[PDB]
Amino acid sequence: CGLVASNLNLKPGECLRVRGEVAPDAKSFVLNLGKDSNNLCLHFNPRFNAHGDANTIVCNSKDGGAWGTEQREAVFPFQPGSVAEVCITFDQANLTVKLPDGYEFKFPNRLNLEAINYMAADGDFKIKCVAFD
Amino acid sequence: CGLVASNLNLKPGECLRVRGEVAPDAKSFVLNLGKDSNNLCLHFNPRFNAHGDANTIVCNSKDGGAWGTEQREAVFPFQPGSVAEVCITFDQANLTVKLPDGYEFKFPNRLNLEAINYMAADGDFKIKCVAFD
Ligand SMILES: CCCO[C@@H]1O[C@H](CO)[C@@H](O[C@@H]2O[C@H](CO)[C@H](O)[C@H](OCc3cn(C)nn3)[C@H]2O)[C@H](O)[C@H]1NC(C)=O
Ligand SMILES: CCCO[C@@H]1O[C@H](CO)[C@@H](O[C@@H]2O[C@H](CO)[C@H](O)[C@H](OCc3cn(C)nn3)[C@H]2O)[C@H](O)[C@H]1NC(C)=O
């Protein structure tokens, strides 16, 4: 329902910087990354109040259409109705997700992707800027 | 084939900014904007040395798969081996294309689109940032 991008050609060590607006009534937003819509290295899902979670980031993978096992993070530097920037890089072992206010976490590269070509936003997150370092 | 973005929901008067690196041996690049690959309100094609043309911007539309009447511009503010920003807006009458070196031109809006939802880049231009005002 938000921006979808393909042919991103993001390679290991490169930095994808995504800035957007968190809706003021936000309950949840999503940023998906991977090979395509059925093969996600990162389903990144901050939940303000949704699917049974309060102020928790849920992450998952999707492999040939099948969801993996969710991982729940320990930090949440997002507020409804504000701008947020997320920066992502990956290597053979992990994606590294950098968040506002100095937070960051790692999520295993379960699909062993060597390139990230697909991104999609959904939920209460309006992308304003995508930049490639 | 370069970055493709959909669901852009660019409304009249909003600005789309694209910054990229022009290859040192560039021949031609394309930014396509519209609804989808068959419906382009703007095919923007700087030709450094391509199709018999030298340092000429070629523009066209595509409606239901059919190319419109091509137009050429009179200024070529691009250099191989350098970074360039392009900035595009639209209303019902025209698209306005703002380029480096202060140059700006209008191209008639020959489709009826409520919003620009699709953008594809191709050719000798590596996209470094995209912004939606
Ligand atoms: C009844 C629930 C109690 O159990 C829950 O069962 C839901 C449905 O399986 C899980 O939620 C699902 O988790 C998936 C990623 O793993 C995706 O996030 C799905 O959203 C897809 C989406 C949203 N957007 C905006 N775009 N795509 C989301 O519905 C949810 O974690 C889990 N909650 C828990 C265990 O506490
Ligand atoms: C005007 C009618 C007859 O004269 C020539 O007929 C070619 C093919 O009809 C035109 O070339 C075509 O112009 C189009 C935009 O009008 C697009 O740019 C096409 O490329 C689309 C594309 C392919 N790819 C891989 N990426 N982009 C390009 O092939 C060429 O300008 C044209 N005019 C001149 C003076 O030369």
Swiss-Prot record, chains A, B:
Top-level lineage group: Eukaryota
Disulfide bonds: none
Domain Galectin as annotated: residue spans: 2-133
Transmembrane segments: none
Gene3D superfamilies per UniProt: 2.60.120.200
Gene Ontology BP term (one): cell-cell adhesion
Residue ranges of coiled coil: none
An example Gene Ontology CC term for this record: extracellular space
Binding-site residues, a beta-D-galactoside: H43, F44, N45, P46, R47, H51, N60, W67, G68, T69, E70
GO molecular function: lactose binding; laminin binding; receptor ligand activity; RNA binding
InterPro entries, per database record: ConA-like_dom_sf, Galectin-like, Galectin_CRD
Modified residues (N6-acetyllysine): K11, K27, K106, K126
Compartment annotation: Secreted, Extracellular space, Extracellular matrix; Cytoplasm; Secreted
Pfam families per the UniProt record, alphabetical: Gal-bind_lectin (PF00337)
Function: Lectin that binds beta-galactoside and a wide array of complex carbohydrates. Plays a role in regulating apoptosis, cell proliferation and cell differentiation. Inhibits CD45 protein phosphatase activity and therefore the dephosphorylation of Lyn kinase. Strong inducer of T-cell apoptosis. Plays a negative role in Th17 cell differentiation via activation of the receptor CD69.
Subunit structure: Homodimer. Binds LGALS3BP. Interacts with CD2, CD3, CD4, CD6, CD7, CD43, ALCAM and CD45. Interacts with laminin (via poly-N-acetyllactosamine). Interacts with SUSD2. Interacts with cargo receptor TMED10; the interaction mediates the translocation from the cytoplasm into the ERGIC (endoplasmic reticulum-Golgi intermediate compartment) and thereby secretion. Interacts with CD69.
Protein name: Galectin-1
Protein's organism: Homo sapiens (Human)
